[PDB]
From a paper:
PolD is the archaea-specific DNA polymerase that functions as the replicase in most of the organisms in Archaea except for Crenarchaeota. The PolD holoenzyme consists of two subunits, DP1 and DP2, which contain the catalytic sites of the 3′–5′ exonuclease and the 5′–3′ DNA polymerase, respectively. PCNA is the sliding clamp that enables high processivity of DNA polymerases and thus is an essential factor for replication. We obtained two structures, Form A and Form B, for the PolD-PCNA-DNA complex.
Next, we tried to improve the resolution, by more strictly refining conditions for sample preparation and EM observation. We successfully obtained a higher resolution map (6.9 Å) as shown in Fig. 1a of the Form A complex, consisting of PolD, PCNA, and primed DNA (25/35) (pri25EMssss and temp35EMssss). In the Form A map, which was obtained from the complex using the (25/35) DNA, the rod-shape density is clearly visualized as typical B-form DNA. In the Form A structure, the 3′-terminus of the nascent DNA chain, where elongation takes place, comes close to the polymerase active site of DP2. Thus, we concluded that this form corresponds to the synthesis mode. The distance between the 3′-terminus of DNA and the polymerization active site (Asp965) of DP2 in our structure was about 13 Å, which is consistent with the reported 15 Å in P. abyssi PolD-DNA complex. While the orientation of the dsDNA in the reported PolD-DNA complex from P. abyssi causes a collision between DNA and the inner wall of the PCNA channel, the dsDNA of our Form A passes through the center of the channel vertically without interacting with the inner wall. This conformation is suitable for the sliding motion of the PCNA clamp during DNA replication. Thus, PolD in the Form A complex appears to fix its orientation using two E171 residues of the PCNA trimer as switch hooks connected for each with DP1 and DP2, respectively. PolD covers the front face of PCNA and occupies the binding surfaces in the Form A complex. Thus, Form A appears to block the access of other PCNA-binding proteins.
Residue numbers in the entry:
A (entry chain E), B (entry chain D): 1 to 249
C (entry chain B): 332 to 364, 372 to 382, 400 to 662, 677 to 1047, 1080 to 1198, 1204 to 1228
D (entry chain B): 8 to 249
Amino acid sequence: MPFEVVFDGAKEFADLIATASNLIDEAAFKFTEEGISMRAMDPSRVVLIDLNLPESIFSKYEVEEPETIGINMDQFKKILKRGKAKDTLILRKGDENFLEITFEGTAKRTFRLPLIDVEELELELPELPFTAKVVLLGEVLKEGIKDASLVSDAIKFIAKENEFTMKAEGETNEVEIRLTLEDEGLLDLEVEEETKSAYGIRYLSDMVKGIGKADEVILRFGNEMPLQMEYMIRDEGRLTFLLAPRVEE
Amino acid sequence: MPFEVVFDGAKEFADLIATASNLIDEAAFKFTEEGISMRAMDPSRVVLIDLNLPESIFSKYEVEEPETIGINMDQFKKILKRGKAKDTLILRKGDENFLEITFEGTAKRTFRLPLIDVEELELELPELPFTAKVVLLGEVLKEGIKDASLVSDAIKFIAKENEFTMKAEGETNEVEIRLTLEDEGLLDLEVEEETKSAYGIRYLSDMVKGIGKADEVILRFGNEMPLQMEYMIRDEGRLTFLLAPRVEE
Amino acid sequence: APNKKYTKEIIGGRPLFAEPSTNGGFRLRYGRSWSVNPATMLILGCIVTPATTVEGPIVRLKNGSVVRVDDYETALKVRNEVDEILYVGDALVNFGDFVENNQTLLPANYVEEWWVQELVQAIKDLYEVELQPFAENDREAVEEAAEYLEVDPDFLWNLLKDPLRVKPDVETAIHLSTVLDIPFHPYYTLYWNTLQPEEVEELQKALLGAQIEWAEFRKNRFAKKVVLENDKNIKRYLELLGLPHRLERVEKKRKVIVVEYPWSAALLTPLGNLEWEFKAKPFYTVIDIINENNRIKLRDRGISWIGKPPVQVLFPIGLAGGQSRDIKKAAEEGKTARVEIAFFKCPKCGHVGPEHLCPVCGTRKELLWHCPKCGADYPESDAKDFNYRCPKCDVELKPYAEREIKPADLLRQAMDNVKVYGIDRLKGVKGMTSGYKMAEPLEKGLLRVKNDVYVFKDGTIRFDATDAPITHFKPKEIGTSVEKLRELGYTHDFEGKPLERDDQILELKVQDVILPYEAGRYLLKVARFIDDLLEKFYGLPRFYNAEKMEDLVGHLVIGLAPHTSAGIIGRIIGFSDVLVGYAHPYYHAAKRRNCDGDEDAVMLLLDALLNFSKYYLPEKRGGKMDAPLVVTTRLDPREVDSEVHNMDVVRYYPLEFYKATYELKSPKEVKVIERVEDGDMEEKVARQLALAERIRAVDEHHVAETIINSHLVPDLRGNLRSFTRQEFRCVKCNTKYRRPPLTGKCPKCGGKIVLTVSKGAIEKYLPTAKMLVTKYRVKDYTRQRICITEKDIKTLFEKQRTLMGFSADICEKMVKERTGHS
Amino acid sequence: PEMKAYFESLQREIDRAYAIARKARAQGKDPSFDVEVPQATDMAGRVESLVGPPGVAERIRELVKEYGKEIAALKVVDEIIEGKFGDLGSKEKYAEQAVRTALAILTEGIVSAPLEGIADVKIKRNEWADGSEYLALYYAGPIRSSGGTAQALSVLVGDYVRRKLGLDRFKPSDEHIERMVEEVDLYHRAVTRLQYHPEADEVRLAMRNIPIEITGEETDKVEVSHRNVPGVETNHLRGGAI
DNA sequence: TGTCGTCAGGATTCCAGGCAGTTCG
DNA sequence: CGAACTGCCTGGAATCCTGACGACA
Ligand SMILES: [Zn+2]
Ligand SMILES: [Zn+2]
C-alpha cells in the first residue's frame, strides 16, 4: 500500500489524467512492482481506455507491495489546475487512507486527500485480427478532425495498399484528405486490404485535443472492426484508446 | 481646487489602480503637497486599503490645495484598462466639477469626465504591537491564496523562527504551504513567538487578481492580531491593506 | 375513526410504507386550545411543529448497543451511525383541536403527572395530609409528606416543580410504591402491548438461564444487573422492546448483552424478581397477567396511535421592451414606445408626461382627459361638466390614451430627480392588469432597484415568514435582557414574582415576534431604502434611524395572510436564530391558517404609507388577496369577562378525563370540553434517503408504491399530448405563436423557433422507476416500463454496439422471463 | 390593567407615524391625498371599511352588543333592505349591498370574497317554463379558493335574501341538470382534483332543492356536449360555482 | 399557486499562436 | 551575420449564473 513517486515536471501526466477524467470519472490505478496500470471502461460500454507506465518514467520510484488504489477524477482535476511546468510532483501514500501530493520550489506545497476505493470489474480484451495498421502524426490528424468536426460527426477512414483517405460526408458539406507515403502527415503504413469505416468524433476530438501536436499515433483497424489508437509516453509507457464504429451508412 | 499630475508609466499606474479596485469600490483620494494618498473602503468595514505616492515617483506633481475626493474606481477602470506601457498621462482638476485625462504617446487623447461625490469618514489604522514581520513577493501569496480559495474556506497561519506555515483547511482536502530560508523569494523575517492566526478567503482572493511580481510585500501580524500587509514599489511608493483577524475560537 | 384516518392518509406520500415495529401513531398530551420532537426530524410526511423540551426516540447504533436520543448535541453526534429505528418518540396531540366527522376518542396513557397526582391523593385520604400539587409545596406540608414517605423535602419540592426533569431513582420509586400498590413508573416501563404470552414464557426462561446480581434498598428486594446472551432466545422482541443495553463481544461468547440499574430493575421488579411463575392465558394481555400474579396493579403506556417573472418596477413598455425590457437598453437604443398610458399637463410650464409631479417647475401637474376613438382633449373640469361624454365619439371619457413616448430622452428627468446613478440591472413591467392603468413613482422604482430587493405584483414590499405558536415564552430563547423587559414595561412574572432570572418561564406574550435572520436582514434593507427615500423625497428627518440588526426591536410591523384584507399590527419584540419562528394564537387564527397558505407576509407601516395605492389593484380579477386596506390591532380576549379563561391555559392535566378516558366517551361532549377548559438532485436524494431510512426502520422489508405510477402515467400521457400538439413560439417575436406547420422561419424574424420538447423530464424520471423496479419486484407495471422504454426507442428511431455487450438490465431480464413463460 | 396604557402608547406611536405620513403627503407628489390604511376601531369599523355603508357602525354596534351577533346581523340586513338610512339605487343594488354586508359581518370582515370575488348579483327570469327566478352571480378571479365556510355562508345569505325578496322556485330542467353533472364530472376527472368526491344523485338532489337557479361566470375554455344551453351566455365550464 | 426541465445570452477566465526581446556558432 | 527560446499578451474559445420559455397538481 505505501509508495513514493517523485518526478520533476509531470505536465504530460497531468493532461493525460485530465483527458482520462473527461472520458470517465470512476478509475482505479493498480500499482505493481513494474509500475502503474489503469483500464477504464465506458458507462455506455462503447469505449475503453488503457494505460501502462513502467518504473522507467519518473525519477524516484519506491513501492512496498503491489495493490489497487482509487482516486476520484473530480478531486484530481481539482488538483492538476495548480501544476507548474517546473514543479516537483511527489506522490506519497502510507497505510492509512491519506494521499499526499507535494511540490518543492519557491514555496513547499503539500496537499492531503482521502483515498476511496474503486471496484470496477477488469477483463482482458480478446484478440481480434486487425488487418489494417498505420502510424501517423498527431498534429495532422488533430487539425483534420477539428476541420471536419463542425460539418458532421461521422468521419470515414479508408485504407488501401499505400493509400489513405480521410473523408467527411453529409448533405451540404464534403471534406476529403489524401495521404500517401510522400505526404507530410503519414509516417508509415501497414495496410493489408481495402478497409473503410466511419467513426464518431466527439470522444475522438476530445482525446486528440488533449494530446499534443508533436506526439505520434498508431491506428489499428479493419473493414468494420473497432479501431484502436495507441501511442507511447517517453518511449517507455503505453496508452491506447479503443472504440467501435457505427453500422449506419 | 486645481492640480495636475504628469506621469510616465501609465501602464504601471493603471495596473496599480486596478489592483486597488479589484478588492472593493470605495476610494477616497487625498491630494496633498506631500503627495497622493488614498484610503479605499468596503461595505464590510474589515479591510482598509491605504496607499501613498510621493513627488519623487511622479514626473510633474503640481498642487494648489489639499483635498479629499471619494470615487468608485469600477467605472473608471474602463479607460485605464486600455493603454500602452510607454506613454504620457496627465490628470488635471480645476474649480469646475470635471476631470481632464490627457493621453499622449504620439497623438492627443483628451477625456473630460464628471466628478462623483461620495460621503465617508476617514478611520485611522490601529497601530497595535505585533510579533511577526515577514517579507516576500507576490507570486507565492497569489498561489497560496488561489489554492486556498479553490480548495477550502478556512486557513491558519503559524509563524515561528524561519518557518512560516499556512494550513488551508476545509472538509475533504487539506492544503499546506511552508516558507523557509531555502525559498529565495522569501526575505528575512522578525519573529520571536509562535504567532497563530485564522483567516478566510471570502474577501481575500480579489486583490490577488491584481497582485504583480516586482513589488515587495511585507506583512506584520501577531497572535490573532489585525494583519497589516504593506507592499512597496520602487522603494518609494507604498500600499498597505489592514484587515481585521477573521479568527474562530 | 382511527382506521378510517389511517386509510385516508394514503392519498399523499409513498403508500404502504408503515413501520411494523411501532404502530402508526404519536403521543397524546391533552392541552387546551401536531408537535413532534425535532430529534426524530434530525434522525430522519405531514405538517411539522417543533417541541424540543421533551424526550426523544430510542434506536441502536453500529456498535450493536441501544441508546435513546436526549439532546441536540447527542442527536447531531449519533444522527449518522444509526442501524434501525425502533420507536418514534412521544409527540404531543391535544384535545382542544376542532376535529369533526366523528373522530373517536384516542386512548390516553398513564403519565407521570397523573401517577403522582393519584399518589398524593391517596396519601392525603390515608394519612390526612393536605398539599398543593402542580407547584412548590409549603414547608409544613412537604415536611410531613417527607416524614410519611421517607423522602427528602427538597426532592419532593423539585418533583412537584418538574417531575420529568427530576426523575426519582427506581429503588425509592418501588419503595414508595410498596406502600400504596400504585402502578409502575411509565418512563421506565417498556412497551409490551404487542407480544404473546407464549413468547413471554421463553423470555422468562432465557432470563432464568442468564446471570443476575442483586441490590436492595429500604425493604425492597430488587436487583442490580442482568447479563444475558443474545443466542439464548429470539432477539426479535428482545430488540423491539426498546431498552438501552450494553453489548460485549470478547467474552468467550459471540453476542453478550448487559443491563444495569436503573434499567434492569425496570424490567425485573414488574416480574417480581422472577419469584412467581408466569403462564400463558388468552384474552388477557401481559399487563393483565402481571397484575393477576402480583399484589400490585399496573397500567399501560403505549396506547395512543393517531394517524417568475421577477419584475421590480412598474414601467409600461410592452413589446417596446421585447423580452428583457431594460430601460437602460431602451435609452441607449433611442427607440419610441407605443403605450396606452395616462399623461399629465402642467398649467404653468405645459410639459406632458406620465409622471405625477412636474420636476421642471415647483408644482404638480394635473391629469388630462382624452377620447381614444376621437381626437378631442378635455381637462377634469370639462370632463365633469360634459357628464363624461364626448360629442364626437359617444364613449365614456377615459383619462388614459394610446400614444407613443420616448423614454430614452424622458429618462434624464428621473435621473436629475434621483441624483444617484448607481444601477446595474433593472427592468419594467410587461402587462397591466388594472383598469385605469395608473402610473408608479419612477424615482421610488429606481431607489428600489439601487437597493436590490424583490417585489410581488401587489405594489408594495412584503416578505414571507413562517411562525408557529407555543404554550410558553422564554427570554433566554428570545434573546432579551431583564432590564430590557423592565424598560419595555414588564415588572412581574407569570406568578407575580419580580424579574431577576433570565431563565424565567413566562406566558406567551401577544405582541412578540420570533422572526428569522433573513427576515431581519430584509427588514433592515427595507428600512434603509425607506430612510433613503424620505431623505431624498421631502427632506424629512429619519424617524426610525435604524442601521443595525438590534435597533429594529421596538418598532411596529404588519402581518398579513392570504384571504385576509386586514393587516394585523404587531410590535417588533424579539428575533430568531433558526430558519423558523413562533407566533401567538391571537395573531394567527383559523382564517390565517386554512387560507391556502401557512406562511404570512410582513411589512413596515411607512412602506405601506409611502407606496400603497388602490390603483395597483387589477380591475376585475385578483391574486391571493385584494389589498392591505385596513390595519387592525385590538383583539381584547374577554378582558372584564373571561380574563382567567384567557390567562389560565398552560400546564394543566385533567385527572377526571384521565380516569374517564378508557370508557369510550364522546369526544363531542361540549359540556365536558367546557368544564375541562374553564431541481432534481435535492429531490432525488431526499426521496432515496427517505426510502433508505424507512427500510432501516422496517428492517429491510418493504413493497412497491403507487404515487410513482400516479406521477409517471400522467407524465407519459402529457408527454404524448405535447408531442402531438407541438406548439412553437418565435424567439424575438415573443407574442406571435407560430403554427405547428413549419414555414422554415418566422416571417417577421429570420431565426430559429423555440419548440416545446418536454422530453428531458421523462428521460430523468426513467432512472428513478428503473432503480425502484430493480430494488423491489412488482407486477402490473413492467408493461408500462417496457412501453415507455420502447416509446423512447422508436421515437429516436443505441446505434453502436461492440462484440462484447451483455448490458445488465432487470427490465430485459423480466422481458425475457415473460417471453419464456409465454 | 396596564395593558390598556401600553395599547394607548402603541396607538400614540401609530398616530405619530400617521402625522409624519400626513406631513409628508402634504406636498402631494403622488396621485393621493388621504390615508389609505386607517386603523380599525372594531368589527363594525372593519366591515364598514370593507363594504360599508359609512355610518351604519352605530347601528351595528348597538344590535350586536345588545342582542347577539347572529340576530343582530339578521336585523341589520332587514333594515338595509328596508332602506332605513335612505336609498342607494335599485333593488338589485340593495340586495347586493345587503349580501355583502351580511357576509362581511358573519366573517368578521376579513375575507374579500363579497368585495371582489363576487362582483355582481342580479335577478333574472325564466322565459322557457314558468317564469321563475335565478340569481345571476357575476363572480371574478379571486373566488376559486373562497373557502368552504365562506361559500356555505354565501349560499345561506343568498337563500335568506331570496326568502326576503319573495321569488318563485326554479324548475330544474333535464338539460340543466345534465350540463351540471357534466361540468361536475369534467372538473372531477380532467380539470383539477377535488377535495370531496361528489355523487350524481347527491348533486341532482342539491340542484333540485335550490329554489331559485344560480348562474355563475366563466372559468376556463372547456366546452360541453350539450351546446347552447338556455340561461348561460356560453358553454364553458363553471368550475367556480362547482 | 407550488414544483421542474429546456433554451439562449453575455460576462468571465483559460489556452494557444503571433509579436517582440535575447543568447547561441 | 541568422536561428531557436523564451515573455507576453491578446484573440479565440470553453464555462457558467441569469433571464426567457413551456410542462403538472
Ligand atoms: Zn410644470
Ligand atoms: Zn371623444
